[PDB]
Curated annotation (Swiss-Prot), chain B:
One of its GO terms (biological process) is photosynthesis. It is found in: Plastid, Chloroplast thylakoid membrane. This is Photosystem II reaction center protein T. The lineage of its organism: Eukaryota, Sar, Stramenopiles, Ochrophyta, Bacillariophyta. The keyword Thylakoid applies. The gene is psbT. It comes from the Eukaryota. Found at the monomer-monomer interface of the photosystem II (PS II) dimer, plays a role in assembly and dimerization of PSII. PSII is a light-driven water plastoquinone oxidoreductase, using light energy to abstract electrons from H(2)O, generating a proton gradient subsequently used for ATP formation. Keywords: Chloroplast, Membrane, Photosynthesis, Photosystem II, Plastid, Thylakoid, Transmembrane, Transmembrane helix. Belongs to the PsbT family. The keyword Heme does not apply.
Swiss-Prot record, chain C:
It comes from the Eukaryota. The record marks H180 as: Stabilizes free radical intermediate. PANTHER family: PHOTOSYSTEM II D2 PROTEIN, PHOTOSYSTEM II PROTEIN D1. Signal peptide: none annotated. The chain crosses the membrane at residues 19-36, 108-123, 132-146, 187-208, 264-278. This is Photosystem II protein D1. Fe cation binds at H205, H262. Its EC number is 1.10.3.9. The D1/D2 heterodimer binds P680, chlorophylls that are the primary electron donor of PSII, and subsequent electron acceptors. It shares a non-heme iron and each subunit binds pheophytin, quinone, additional chlorophylls, carotenoids and lipids. D1 provides most of the ligands for the Mn4-Ca-O5 cluster of the oxygen-evolving complex (OEC). There is also a Cl(-1) ion associated with D1 and D2, which is required for oxygen evolution. The PSII complex binds additional chlorophylls, carotenoids and specific lipids. It is found in: Plastid, Chloroplast thylakoid membrane. GO terms for molecular function: chlorophyll binding; electron transporter, transferring electrons within the cyclic electron transport pathway of photosynthesis activity; iron ion binding; oxidoreductase activity, acting on diphenols and related substances as donors, oxygen as acceptor. It comes from Thalassiosira pseudonana.
UniProtKB/Swiss-Prot annotation, chain E:
It is a single-pass membrane protein. This is Photosystem II reaction center protein I. Keywords: Chloroplast, Membrane, Photosynthesis, Photosystem II, Plastid, Reaction center, Thylakoid, Transmembrane, Transmembrane helix. PSII is composed of 1 copy each of membrane proteins PsbA, PsbB, PsbC, PsbD, PsbE, PsbF, PsbH, PsbI, PsbJ, PsbK, PsbL, PsbM, PsbT, PsbX, PsbY, PsbZ, Psb30/Ycf12, at least 3 peripheral proteins of the oxygen-evolving complex and a large number of cofactors. It forms dimeric complexes. The keyword Thylakoid applies. It is found in: Plastid, Chloroplast thylakoid membrane. One of the components of the core complex of photosystem II (PSII), required for its stability and/or assembly. PSII is a light-driven water:plastoquinone oxidoreductase that uses light energy to abstract electrons from H(2)O, generating O(2) and a proton gradient subsequently used for ATP formation. It consists of a core antenna complex that captures photons, and an electron transfer chain that converts photonic excitation into a charge separation. It comes from Thalassiosira pseudonana (Marine diatom). InterPro entries: PSII_PsbI, PSII_PsbI_sf.
Swiss-Prot record, chain F:
This is Photosystem II reaction center protein L. Keywords: Chloroplast, Membrane, Photosynthesis, Photosystem II, Plastid, Reaction center, Thylakoid, Transmembrane, Transmembrane helix. Pfam families: PsbL. Belongs to the PsbL family. InterPro entries: PSII_PsbL (IPR003372), PSII_PsbL_sf (IPR037266). The gene is psbL.
């Protein structure tokens, strides 16, 4: 549902067609991790929720470069999943 | 601009069909 | 007299200009909505992504099409056989982008034609006739249903149905011949014989009946004016037509009974169309026509070609070029 | 949604309500004519078509 | 989009019920040999 | 519904036909140059 | 009234027999036995409706 | 894009025969009305 | 007559059920460990599933 633990408790036949497969999960807590050495970010998911295209519009007797909202012509097929990378520290900062 | 010509021809054909069906010579 | 009784009396009345009946209650709204949607879509619809590869195709007059090239594009390949009503889309623009109107038009239209058949039977019953005209009408309905619904069901996607346009049918026929080798299925041969024989018999009947007209006008009056609505005259002065047909060909072949003649006239094309519709429906499940590729070989073992091999070469040429960007793997299953 | 398996496509109370209202309205109109039918063993007939009035 | 669904369902059920209850109103007796 | 007693006939003799044809042709001749611009 | 009494007596004999033996066999009362078979099992009903609105 | 003469061809070749046929029908009806004595001659 | 032959049809359906549950079993292609013959011990009876 919202968290991964609840999502793993459902079956595939129970999720088909609902639209939950295109959603991104939710996390609960406020702690700290601190990556050791040889860590890897695994299972990254990115879900957009708003789109805009740069254009030229007229506000009042003037024209400016403004981002106008757009509607998705396709369907729920726009979420990225399964991204993996390798973490490291350079000077106290994390690099993906 | 030829879309106007196409639409006019099709609507004219439909008008002809309407008049043929509803304003017809009595078979008697 | 109750209100319902008066309504029933009006609905099944024979005094109306156009009979309504109870099948009309289904025929009229469906056909009217299909007609309205078809006209609006054919005039002013935006391009539709038919192959599911984000490559939309234009089909409306306002987007640079003429009458010959315009069409209503089938739904997207990504949808498949899924039901796609208007209320299941996030917006009307998305509905138009994925080929929404095709499903609406075809479904309401098929319901309309079935109700048309029922209405034909109903008026026949109310007038005191014999109830078998709609059986004859069932053949075009069978063919249209076969294509529009049965082919997508077998192939698994609405995007394989026949487009509602003039060149769309040509595309449909060419791809169908490439993939299923029609023209070698005996049912298609039966259909071709049906249409050719129907035209031949129609011409023969018209010529024979028109030649045997009795003289009642003289010169300055069209011969059609001699017949009166209600006149009693059997539809052929026999001696003339009977002798003509007995002398033209082998004499023992001559239909001297009108009932049998008209029954044969009704029977031939209807049976032909039934057989060809069933052929299309069966080929929808990949039971193709005869295959005679590389069937004649010499003593050594080399292949000697026939005309079937030339047909096969044409089929290969059609096959390798259709839906160029849609396939990723060697077999077109 | 689209691929779910609801009965008759019903996913809300209003849809069920309007279906009930339709069947019941036409049913009441029909009842206004055929609501006095009895099952006593003298309203029956012996034939192929029920010509026994109502 | 739900209101459109409600209206379409109402129309469809209205016409289908008209058909169904019309055929139940002693239709076989409506012939010219009554 | 019935036979309307208010129907009549329309006439046009040859002189009026000639006048109409001449008027139409001359008017077209006059205005064609300005229509073409 | 006598006819109604005797009919209800026979029907209630059958009903009491059935209720007692159903309770004995299922280890539950009638309400907890009929109530579950009214809506759905949990493992079969769909997850819900998650399509965003307005996109 | 398209040829300009097609406009003239289509419009003229559609309009002229239509008026010709309408004239035929109307003169036939007028002769029929004239033959039968009535209010309209 | 309709009722008699209908009762016969119902008996046939119950016979199929009896074959599935006790008289050897049927071939289940979703079997846990490869398709094989097995006894169906807990058939589902919730009317919602069947009539859905
Ligand atoms: C005779 C009336 C009639 C009938 C039968 C249909 C039938 C249909 N219409 Mg249509 N329509 C009609 C009149 C009709 N239309 C009119 C007058 C309008 C203008 C307001 C529309 C506007 C319209 C739109 C805008 C849409 C449809 C759609 C549909 C389809 C699905 C409808 C649906 O889910 O209903 C549900 C109905 C029920 C659940 C009740 C049925 C209960 C009985 C028992 C039927 C059981 C039959 C069963 C198979 C046996 C279906 C082919 C949709 C479509 O084609 O999407 C692709 C769609 O988007 N219609
Ligand atoms: C000379 C060669 C020849 C001939 C004679 C035929 C003949 C035929 N082919 Mg064919 N074909 C050929 C070569 C030929 N083919 C070749 C070379 C190819 C390969 C490219 C094909 C590929 C091919 C395919 C793929 C198909 C045919 C089909 C057919 C049949 C047409 C079915 C039909 O029209 O009735 C059917 C009648 C209808 C569909 C009309 C239905 C009318 C509806 C019910 C009502 C419509 C009302 C309308 C909308 C409103 C009216 C307007 C109002 C104002 C009055 C017919 C027997 C089709 C077939 O078998 O049909 C099943 C078919 O699918 N052929
Ligand atoms: C010499 C001229 C000639 C002759 C004798 C035939 C004879 C025949 N053609 Mg044929 N055909 C011809 C010219 C000819 N065709 C031409 C010019 C074309 C267009 C290029 C076709 C296209 C054609 C098709 C597409 C089909 C035939 C078929 C047939 C066979 C059944 C037709 C039938 O009985 O119709 C009824 C007529 C009288 C009862 C028959 C052997 C059909 C067949 O069964 O093929 C085996 C068939 O499918 N022909
Ligand atoms: C319409 C009435 C009705 C309904 C819906 C059920 C329904 C059920 N009965 Mg049941 N039963 C009924 C009348 C009914 N019974 C009557 C009148 C009798 C008396 C003969 C029984 C005797 C009976 C027995 C002996 C058993 C059931 C069992 C069952 C369940 C399987 C199911 C819930 C079985 C059960 O609940 O086992 C778990 C079971 O063992 N019933
Ligand atoms: C005592 C009354 C009685 C009985 C027992 C039957 C029985 C049967 N009739 Mg029938 N029949 C009856 C009266 C009866 N009829 C009457 C009054 C008429 C009018 C004259 C007919 C006219 C008639 C015709 C015209 C035909 C039959 C046929 C059949 C057989 C169909 C079997 C089949 O295909 O199932 C297939 C599946 C089965 C499933 C398994 C069957 C179970 C295991 C058997 C259970 C038997 C059980 C002890 C009997 C229960 C008692 C019963 C009252 C419920 C079946 C044996 C058909 C046939 O083939 O006859 C040879 C057929 O064509 N009947
Ligand atoms: C509703 C009836 C129904 C349905 C849907 C099924 C379905 C099935 N049966 Mg089954 N069966 C039934 C009744 C039914 N059975 C009965 C009564 C018997 C006893 C004779 C059997 C005996 C039986 C055996 C012995 C076997 C099956 C098997 C199967 C499976 C594959 C066979 C197949 O192709 O089904 C075809 C079934 C149909 C096409 C029936 C469709 C009926 C639809 C719903 C319409 C019915 C309404 C009808 C018009 C009545 C109108 C009423 C009027 C008031 C309007 C499938 C799940 C096989 C299997 O897989 O076992 C492992 C198998 O071996 N069945
Ligand atoms: C047999 C005939 C008896 C009926 C006589 C009446 C004939 C009238 C003609 C009916 C045509 C109108 C029907 C349109 C219904 C429609 O499209 O529903 C369209 C709906 C689909 O509904 C869609 O469902 C989707 C599911 O995710 C979504 O919810 C969509 O929002 C929803 O629109 O389909 C049904 O309701 C089909 C149910 C009927 C199938 C079971 C029939 C039960 C009896 C079976 C015996 C016959 C087989
Ligand atoms: C689409 C874009 C292009 C446009 C092209 C044109 C499209 C037009 C489509 C709509 C035109 C046809 C519908 C209107 C005609 C009509 O309803 O006649 C229908 C007639 C008139 O109705 C009733 O009226 C008549 C008069 S009265 O009822 O007796 O008063 C009566 O004679 C008749 O019996 C009775 O049924 O009869 C019916 O069947 C009902
Ligand atoms: C080997 C078995 C394998 C299956 C084969 C199936 C063969 C079925 C044969 C019987 C079917 C019904 C025969 C006709 C009945 C009838 O309607 O009469 C109508 C008349 C009978 O003659 C008329 O008959 C009248 C007498 S009577 O009433 O028919 O008795 C007479 O009065 C009148 O003069 C005369 O014109 O027949 C015709 O004129 C219509 C021609 C088409 C009818 C079929 C004729 C035989 C076809 C053979 C099979 C062709 C296969 C085609 C394959 C696509
Ligand atoms: C009434 C229903 C028919 C609609 C009117 C048909 C005639 C006008 O339809 C129109 O189609 C295209 C719509 O983009 C136009 O295409 C162009 O029209 C303008 C011509 O001044 C251009 O400045 C625009 O860039 C462009 O829209 C065609 O010039 C015209 O043919
Ligand atoms: C029931 C329709 C209202 C719409 C709310 C949610 C729609 C999702 C399901 C609608 C169609 C599915 O069919 C439906 O059949 C059952 C009853 O016949 C429903 O069950 C429903 O009725 C039961 C009987 O009172 C209630 O106890 C349940 O709380 C209720 O959920 C299931 O929830 C669903 O499977
Ligand atoms: O869509 Mn119409 O054509 Ca039946 O194969 Mn695959 O898909 Mn597409 O290609 Mn080939
Ligand atoms: Cl592929
Ligand atoms: Fe005739």
């Amino acid at each position: 549902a919202i968290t991964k633990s609840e999502l793993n408790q459902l079956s595939y036949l129970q999720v088909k067609g609902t639209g939950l497969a295109n959603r991104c999960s939710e996390v609960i807590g406020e702690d700290t991790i601190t990556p050791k050495s040889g860590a890897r970010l695994v299972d990254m998911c990115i879900e957009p929720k708003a789109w805009a295209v740069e254009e030229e519009i007229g506000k009042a007797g003037k024209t400016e470069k403004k981002f106008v909202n757009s509607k998705v012509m396709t369907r729920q097929t726009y979420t990225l999943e399964g991204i993996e990378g390798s973490l490291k520290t350079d000077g106290g900062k994390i690099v993906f | 601009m030829e879309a106007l010509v196409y639409t006019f021809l099709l609507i004219g054909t439909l008008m002809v069909i309407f008049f043929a069906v509803f304003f017809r010579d009595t078979p008697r | 007299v109750s209100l319902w009784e008066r309504f029933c009396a009006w609905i099944t009345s024979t005094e109306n200009r156009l009979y309504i009946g109870w099948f009309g209650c289904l025929m009229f709204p469906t056909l009217l909505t299909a007609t309205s949607c078809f006209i609006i879509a054919f005039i002013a619809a935006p391009p539709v992504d038919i192959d599911g590869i984000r490559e939309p195709v234009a089909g409306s007059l306002l987007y640079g099409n003429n009458i010959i090239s315009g069409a209503v594009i089938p739904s997207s390949n990504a949808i498949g056989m899924h039901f796609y009503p208007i209320w299941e889309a996030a917006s009307v623009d998305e509905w138009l982008y994925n080929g929404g109107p095709y499903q609406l038009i075809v479904l309401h239209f098929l319901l309309g034609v079935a109700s048309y058949m029922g209405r034909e039977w109903e008026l026949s019953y109310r007038l005191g006739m014999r109830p078998w005209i709609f059986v004859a009408f069932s053949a075009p309905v069978a063919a249209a249903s076969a294509v529009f619904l049965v082919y997508p069901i077998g192939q698994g996607s609405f995007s394989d149905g026949m487009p509602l346009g003039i060149s769309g049918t040509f595309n449909f026929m060419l791809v169908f011949q490439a993939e299923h080798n029609i023209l070698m299925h005996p049912f298609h041969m039966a259909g071709v014989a049906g249409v050719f024989g129907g035209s031949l018999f129609s011409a023969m009947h018209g010529s024979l009946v028109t030649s045997s007209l009795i003289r009642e006008t003289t010169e300055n009056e069209s011969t059609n004016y001699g017949y009166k609505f209600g006149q009693e005259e059997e539809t052929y002065n026999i001696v003339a037509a009977h002798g003509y047909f007995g002398r033209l060909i082998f004499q023992y072949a001559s239909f001297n009974n009108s009932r049998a003649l008209h029954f044969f006239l009704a029977l031939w094309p209807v049976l032909g169309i039934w057989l060809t519709a069933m052929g299309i429906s069966t080929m929808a499940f990949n039971l193709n026509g005869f295959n005679f590729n590389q069937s004649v070989v010499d003593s050594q073992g080399r292949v000697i070609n026939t005309w079937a091999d030339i047909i096969n070469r044409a089929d290969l040429g059609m096959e390798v070029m259709h839906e160029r960007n849609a396939h990723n793997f060697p077999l077109d299953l | 949604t689209e691929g779910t398996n609801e009965w008759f496509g019903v996913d809300d109370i209003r849809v069920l309500a309007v279906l009930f209202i339709g069947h019941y309205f036409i049913l009441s109109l029909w009842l206004g004519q055929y609501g006095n039918a009895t099952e006593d063993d003298d309203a029956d007939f012996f034939g192929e078509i029920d010509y026994t009035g109502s | 989009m739900l209101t459109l669904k409600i209206l379409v369902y109402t129309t469809v059920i209205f016409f289908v019920s008209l058909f169904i209850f019309g055929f139940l109103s002693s239709d076989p007796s409506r012939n010219p040999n009554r | 519904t019935g036979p309307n007693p208010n129907k009549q006939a329309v006439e046009l003799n040859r002189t009026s036909l000639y006048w109409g044809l001449l008027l139409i042709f001359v008017l077209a001749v006059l205005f064609s140059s300005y229509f073409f611009n | 009234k006598q006819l109604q009494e005797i009919k209800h007596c026979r029907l209630a004999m059958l009903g009491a027999f059935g209720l007692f033996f159903q309770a004995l066999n299922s280890g539950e009362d009638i309400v907890s036995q009929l109530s579950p078979a009214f809506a759905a099992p949990e493992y079969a009903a769909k997850a819900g409706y998650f399509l965003p609105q307005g996109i | 894009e398209v040829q300009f003469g097609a406009y003239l061809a289509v419009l003229l070749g559609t309009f002229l025969p239509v008026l010709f046929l309408i004239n035929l029908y109307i003169q036939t009806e007028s002769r029929k009305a004239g033959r039968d004595g009535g209010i309209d001659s | 007559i309709l009722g008699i032959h209908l009762c016969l049809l119902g008996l046939g359906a119950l016979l199929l059920v009896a074959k599935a549950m006790y008289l050897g079993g049927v071939y289940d292609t979703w079997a846990p460990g490869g398709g094989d013959v097995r006894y169906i011990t807990t058939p589902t009876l919730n009317p919602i599933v069947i009539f859905g």
